[PDB]
């Protein structure tokens, strides 16, 4: 027996194929998927005919084709993307306050709250699979980019997640090298350091929330006993992503873009999505809340930016 079926690497380039009924995808293709469920074990059916099938990079072709598409050369990609997809495309993408969320499972909250902030900040990815499936999500359909998150990530469906460590995966993927920043240290005794930092780094910060504070200055202990002071002298970057461990903060309507609330601790921890609109909105997964003032422990604020020039002298 034979019908006919279609295999790909990234769902662009099909490839017509012949398959002996009598044997298994596995058999035939080595690791097969449709759409995240695994038939290497599955001979093919008649519903089969004229269906389209991810395999692994076995010819050189596939995997020519693979790294264009994910920009990657890790053969376990497509497994553990295929693996994330069999659980994402069942999870409920509504529309909460015209953003495109996720109803909470499989411990995905800190998934959800990166995935709201992503569709409030100018980025683009280098990746086409990262680009189109990112486009879809903000669209509504969202399951094949939360998947791409998890195998960019290293993660798997259920894992817990920091949504700082998940931005930081996911802008190594975007095209953020025009992003510049440049620091001043100055320490009562060691001096005035300065650094400059490239892409990735240069919209980032772990320690303060407030970004007005990180252009005053910050105190930090010096590697040589004493304090040290800390701020920004130049920023060139659409946005920043403040971080700071979970304290309770105070939200100011209007002085920021959107922000990570996380409660809880140890395995009992929790994100929160909180945007700046017209007034305060609270997005937890499915659910949506509205608030004139918010105080709450805030880890993450995101703002925006285009270029910043500071006042302090050198
Ligand atoms: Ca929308
Ligand atoms: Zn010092």
């Known amino acids: 027996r034979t019908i006919k079926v279609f295999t790909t690497v990234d769902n662009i380039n099909l490839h017509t194929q012949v398959v002996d009924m009598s044997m298994t995808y596995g058999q035939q293709f080595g690791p097969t998927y449709l759409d995240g469920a695994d038939v290497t074990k599955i001979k093919p059916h008649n519903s089969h005919e004229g269906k389209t099938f991810y395999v692994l ?5 596939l995997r020519v084709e693979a ?48 995935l709201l902030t992503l569709q409030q900040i100018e980025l683009k990815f280098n990746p086409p699979a990262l680009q189109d499936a990112y486009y879809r999500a903000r669209a509504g359909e969202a399951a094949n980019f939360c998947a791409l998150i998890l195998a960019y990530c290293n993660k798997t469906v259920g894992e817990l997640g920091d949504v700082r460590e998940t931005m930081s995966y996911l802008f190594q993927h975007a095209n953020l090298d025009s992003c510049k920043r440049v620091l001043n240290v100055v320490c009562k005794t060691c001096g005035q350091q300065q650094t400059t930092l490239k892409g990735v780094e240069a919209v980032m910060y772990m320690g303060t929330l407030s970004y007005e504070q990180f252009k005053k200055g910050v105190q930090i202990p010096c590697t040589c006993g004493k304090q040290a002071t800390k701020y920004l002298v130049q ?20 002085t920021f873009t959107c922000a990570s609330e996380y409660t809880g601790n140890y395995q009992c921890g929790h994100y929160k999505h909180i945007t700046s609109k017209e007034t305060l909105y609270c997005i937890d997964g499915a659910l949506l809340t509205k608030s004139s003032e918010y105080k709450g422990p805030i880890t993450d604020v995101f703002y925006k930016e285009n270029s910043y020039t500071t006042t302090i002298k050198p």
């Open 235 to 254: 920023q060139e970057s659409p946005f920043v992503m403040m971080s700071a461990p979970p304290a309770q903060y105070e939200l100011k309507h209007g």
């Open 57 to 61: 990079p076995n010819d050189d072709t």
């Open 67 to 114: 790294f264009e598409y994910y920009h990657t050369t890790d053969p376990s990609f497509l497994g553990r993307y295929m693996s994330a997809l069999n659980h994402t495309k069942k999870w409920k993408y509504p529309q909460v306050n015209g953003l495109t969320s996720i109803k909470w499972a499989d411990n995905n909250s800190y998934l959800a709250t990166a």
